[PDB]
């Protein structure tokens, strides 16, 4: 199943897979504290469309040179491509939260990101500022400390997964440092 989930990612083509409820309880037994961890991914990706639309909007309000003419978020071809890199960080850290490892995050996403941002003129000091908002956004969502959208939850503690995603977000930022 997780090797079948590995067959979703690495195939270099669009693929999809689900897990039925007979196969689901084997996955909750194989991973530890998995009812938190399946709630951990579902807290993020249900609010992922506002998470990248506020973090890269918060990158602009701290650095307004990207909406200068000639700046790298000036046209809407580039502005939609900045959110397209914003979401594709956020899915690949969510599956890394879901599988519990970081090896799919390095090999499928971050191998070759420094070699493609310098070749494209992407400001690496500004995109580290964009992903650190997404580090700060996700720790509010994982501890239910968002001020606008608070979600219902089976109560308890999930601060171990709060430190797990902050070990995933800085691995993005160390890859583009």
């Amino acid at each position: 199943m997780l090797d079948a989930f590995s067959r979703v990612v690495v195939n270099s083509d669009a693929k999809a897979a689900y897990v039925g409820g007979s196969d689901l309880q084997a996955l909750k037994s194989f991973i530890a504290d998995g009812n938190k961890r399946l709630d951990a991914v579902n807290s993020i990706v249900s609010n992922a469309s506002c998470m990248v639309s506020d973090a890269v909007s918060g990158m602009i309000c701290e650095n307004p040179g990207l909406i200068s003419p000639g700046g790298n978020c000036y046209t809407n071809r580039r502005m939609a491509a900045c959110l397209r890199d914003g979401e594709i960080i956020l899915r690949y850290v969510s599956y890394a939260l879901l599988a519990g490892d970081a090896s799919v995050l390095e090999d499928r996403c971050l191998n070759g990101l420094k070699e493609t941002y310098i070749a494209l003129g992407v400001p690496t000091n500004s995109s580290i500022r964009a992903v650190s908002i997404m580090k700060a956004q996700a720790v509010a969502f994982i501890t239910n400390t968002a001020t606008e959208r608070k979600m219902s939850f089976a109560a308890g503690d999930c601060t171990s997964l709060a430190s797990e995603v902050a070990s995933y977000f800085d691995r993005v930022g160390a890859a583009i440092s």
């Binding site: 979703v8 083509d13 693929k15 990706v45 939609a80 397209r84 899915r91 070699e115 493609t116």
Partner: protein
């Protein structure tokens, strides 16, 4: 009812208050027209008696109505003035058309589109184009019945072809205003032993005169053409094409299949797992109302719905001409087949048991109701 001499009523043109009745019937149209020498002679008011003027008005204006003796007293009102000379035979078919006996076998029983096509068949003896329908379908929308029959009888096409003394008939004029307009006239006018009453849908000229291309089928025009103009080609060659058409023209086999709506489907061996070609493109046609408690929800299975080939010409041809500067950067030698595309977890909502999650990778592009 009006006067023993009346050329024109209703004062539509100004020059009919001074217009005499025609003293003699009008001549034939002056082109050559090779077909009409095989045709029977036209019946007028001043060559023939009232036994055959009434029959040919029943054979052309009434189609083939089978009016009884107690049926149509409104025609017997209008015929009793024509024998007294109180109105011309041009005005008589205006009185036939505005009467309810024309209405209660052609207006209420046929469709809205078919009522116009039967009016060109009866009054003018031809079949219209699409622009002639589109000017006649607005009179049925804004002005009604009586003004729409005024558009035939007070037209200049009627008065040049028949005038005030000639019974309507199929006028073969040889040189036509369109090559379609000959053979759409001929298809609309079959010979004897045909009526309009069984075909409550006509459905064949209702889709040849609908779009301006797709002229009608040749055996549907070789059928009512006259004789020593069809023979040695209707012994057994096109004759089985005529009989297979007649079982389709009768009972109104709807021409979605072979006439217009022309989709090259895949062969039956290509799918074979979504099998049973009777059930291949069927969907649940579901409908909910949700009002009080008389409020049904009727999941029917729908028929084989076809790609409509014009909503796929609105889509994918007019718009989606996105189509610009797709160089997308081209650095990414490590992307290795897909580049932009998130793991896309998507948790199927945890209703506490027997409900589970699956994941699927996809390329992700941000939408157009997104940033700024």
């Amino acid at each position: 009812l009006t006067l023993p001499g009346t050329a024109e009523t209703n004062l539509a043109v100004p020059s009919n208050a001074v217009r005499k009745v025609q003293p003699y019937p009008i001549a034939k149209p002056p082109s050559y027209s090779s077909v009409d020498s095989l045709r029977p002679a036209r019946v007028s008011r001043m060559d023939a008696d009232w036994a055959t003027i009434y029959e040919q008005v029943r054979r052309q204006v009434m189609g083939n109505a089978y009016v009884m003796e107690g049926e149509a007293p409104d025609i017997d009102v209008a015929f009793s003035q024509l024998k007294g000379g109180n109105l011309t035979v041009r005005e008589f078919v205006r009185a036939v058309g505005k009467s309810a006996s024309y209405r209660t076998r052609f207006m209420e029983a046929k469709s809205s589109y078919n009522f116009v096509l039967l009016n060109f068949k009866h009054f003018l003896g031809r079949a219209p184009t699409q622009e002639e329908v589109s000017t006649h379908i607005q009179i049925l929308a804004t002005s009604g019945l009586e003004a729409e029959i005024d558009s035939y009888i007070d037209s200049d096409e009627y008065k040049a072809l028949f005038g005030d003394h000639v019974v309507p008939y199929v006028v073969y004029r040889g040189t036509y205003l369109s090559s379609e307009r000959f053979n759409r006239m001929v298809k609309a006018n079959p010979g004897g032993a045909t009526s309009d009453k069984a075909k409550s849908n006509l459905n064949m000229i209702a889709t040849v005169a609908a779009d301006l291309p797709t002229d009608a089928i040749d055996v549907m025009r070789g059928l009512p053409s006259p004789i020593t103009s069809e023979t040695l080609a209707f012994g057994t060659a096109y004759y089985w094409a005529k009989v297979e058409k007649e079982a389709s023209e009768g009972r109104s086999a709807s021409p979605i299949g072979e006439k217009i709506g022309k989709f090259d489907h895949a062969p039956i061996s290509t799918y074979t797992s979504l099998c049973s070609y009777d059930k291949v493109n069927k969907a649940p046609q579901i409908s909910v109302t949700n009002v009080g408690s008389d409020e049904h929800s009727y999941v029917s299975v729908t028929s084989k719905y076809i790609a409509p080939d014009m909503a796929a010409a609105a889509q994918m041809l007019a718009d989606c001409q996105k189509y610009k500067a797709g160089g997308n950067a081209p650095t990414g030698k490590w992307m290795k087949y897909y580049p932009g595309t998130t793991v896309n977890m998507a948790p199927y909502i945890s209703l506490n048991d027997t409900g589970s999650d699956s994941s699927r990778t996809v390329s992700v592009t941000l939408d157009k109701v997104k940033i700024s």
